[PDB]
């Protein structure tokens, strides 16, 4: 009972993780902030290289 | 005595006209886009920085 539902939320969160990936880009030239969800940004002095 | 060069005597003038316009003007040659894909004239300015930011 528990393992079929604990995998179901892991199926439900994975069903939400891909549908948010379709939200980010409506076109190749789409947006500079909607592409700023998957690829990350951070605080000052994170990216060393 | 075939080819005689000439010269002209004239003052060579580094005058000082109104400068604070002339300083600001090579800022507006470079634009900055708020978009993901850009418009193929900033895109070769944006590449030219990537190079020489990887040597300093």
Short mmCIF file of C-alpha atoms in Angstrom, two decimals, chain A residues 28-32 35, chain B residues 33-38:
data_model
loop_
_atom_site.label_atom_id
_atom_site.label_comp_id
_atom_site.label_asym_id
_atom_site.label_seq_id
_atom_site.Cartn_x
_atom_site.Cartn_y
_atom_site.Cartn_z
CA UNK A 28 13.89 29.06 -29.93
CA UNK A 29 14.26 32.81 -29.38
CA UNK A 30 11.90 32.70 -26.41
CA UNK A 31 13.06 34.31 -23.19
CA UNK A 32 16.01 35.20 -20.99
CA UNK A 35 15.47 29.70 -19.60
CA UNK B 33 19.94 42.74 -25.43
CA UNK B 34 17.44 41.39 -22.93
CA UNK B 35 16.75 38.27 -25.00
CA UNK B 36 18.02 34.72 -25.29
CA UNK B 37 18.86 34.58 -28.98
CA UNK B 38 20.22 37.88 -30.21
#
